[PDB]
Amino acid sequence: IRSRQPLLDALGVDLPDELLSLALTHRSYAYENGGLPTNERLEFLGDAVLGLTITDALFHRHPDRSEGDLAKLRASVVNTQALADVARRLCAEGLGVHVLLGRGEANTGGADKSSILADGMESLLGAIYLQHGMEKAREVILRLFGPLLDAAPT
Amino acid sequence: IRSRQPLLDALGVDLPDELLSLALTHRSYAYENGGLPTNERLEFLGDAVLGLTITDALFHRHPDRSEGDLAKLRASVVNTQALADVARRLCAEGLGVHVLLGRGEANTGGADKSSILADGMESLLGAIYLQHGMEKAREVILRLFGPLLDAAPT
Ligand SMILES: [Ca+2]
Ligand SMILES: [Ca+2]
Ligand SMILES: [Ca+2]
Ligand SMILES: [Ca+2]
């Protein structure tokens, strides 16, 4: 846990301490500690960044498939379940270990709630894009989602 | 009508004839003429490009607003109605004039169906991004949606 280097490593980029902390701040932790900013805005941003990147890739990889099919192939790659699994294996400990959660949420399995893991994954993508820009975020995403992509066709 | 320069001008970039034609190809025209490729894939792509750009802008312009609010501000800028109006005033003739439509769709008001205009607008953004890349598409979009954005806050 504690050390975030194995995480900054999985990601492949570097993130200032404050931004990475915000990215890992689930709302529960935020409320329990006096109304701290949450990773929700970052999640919102990361969702659009991930959405375009996966859309762009599928568009190029399947020139002959229809919008509808493309929409179906995308849904395979970015659903809550698929995102959470990327967080769970992002690094040895997994992402769950690094998420800041409230007492309640904490002992209720919070650190493994796919829901929370998916949101968290999106927040990080959001932070990366904010700190570095589209192309770097693109790289990182093509790497973490490189497999789930090849899988989508089936 | 016919000449697409006033359009390539409004857009502010240049697009190869074939790509611009595809972008303007509504499915009706496509079916009526033997099963031509449609602007639907381009629309799908343009939607994600527009989505990230507007998300990114609102994120920066309102640092203190919550995800929920941000989601509400975005919906103002990218709804069917808002998109169609951008197409109608994109250029003198408007976009409707340049869309390729089938006989049926044509005389049923097709060229003014906000639905068709919105999709068309998204297809062009899709073509621009495909031809030039994210930053140029970003520019173009920040320009066409520059107003609707300032409006969103109210
Ligand atoms: Ca949520
Ligand atoms: Ca989300
Ligand atoms: Ca449609
Ligand atoms: Ca659409």
From Swiss-Prot, chains A, B:
<keyword id="KW-0507">mRNA processing</keyword>
<feature type="domain" description="RNase III">
    <location>
        <begin position="18"/>
        <end position="133"/>
    </location>
</feature>
<keyword id="KW-0694">RNA-binding</keyword>
<dbReference type="GO" id="GO:0046872">
    <property type="term" value="F:metal ion binding"/>
</dbReference>
<keyword id="KW-0460">Magnesium</keyword>
<keyword id="KW-0255">Endonuclease</keyword>
<dbReference type="GO" id="GO:0010468">
    <property type="term" value="P:regulation of gene expression"/>
</dbReference>
<keyword id="KW-0479">Metal-binding</keyword>
<keyword id="KW-0378">Hydrolase</keyword>
<comment type="subunit">
    <text>Homodimer.</text>
</comment>
<dbReference type="GO" id="GO:0004525">
    <property type="term" value="F:ribonuclease III activity"/>
</dbReference>
<feature type="active site">
    <location>
        <position position="47"/>
    </location>
</feature>
<dbReference type="GO" id="GO:0008033">
    <property type="term" value="P:tRNA processing"/>
</dbReference>
<keyword id="KW-0698">rRNA processing</keyword>
<keyword id="KW-0540">Nuclease</keyword>
<protein>
    <recommendedName>
        <fullName>Ribonuclease 3</fullName>
        <ecNumber>3.1.26.3</ecNumber>
    </recommendedName>
</protein>
<keyword id="KW-0963">Cytoplasm</keyword>
<comment type="function">
    <text>Digests double-stranded RNA. Involved in the processing of primary rRNA transcript to yield the immediate precursors to the large and small rRNAs (23S and 16S). Processes some mRNAs, and tRNAs when they are encoded in the rRNA operon. Processes pre-crRNA and tracrRNA of type II CRISPR loci if present in the organism.</text>
</comment>
<feature type="binding site">
    <location>
        <position position="122"/>
    </location>
    <ligand>
        <name>Mg(2+)</name>
    </ligand>
</feature>
<feature type="binding site">
    <location>
        <position position="119"/>
    </location>
    <ligand>
        <name>Mg(2+)</name>
    </ligand>
</feature>
<dbReference type="GO" id="GO:0006364">
    <property type="term" value="P:rRNA processing"/>
</dbReference>
<keyword id="KW-0819">tRNA processing</keyword>
<comment type="similarity">
    <text>Belongs to the ribonuclease III family.</text>
</comment>
<dbReference type="GO" id="GO:0005737">
    <property type="term" value="C:cytoplasm"/>
</dbReference>
<dbReference type="GO" id="GO:0006397">
    <property type="term" value="P:mRNA processing"/>
</dbReference>
<feature type="binding site">
    <location>
        <position position="43"/>
    </location>
    <ligand>
        <name>Mg(2+)</name>
    </ligand>
</feature>
<dbReference type="GO" id="GO:0003725">
    <property type="term" value="F:double-stranded RNA binding"/>
</dbReference>
<feature type="active site">
    <location>
        <position position="122"/>
    </location>
</feature>
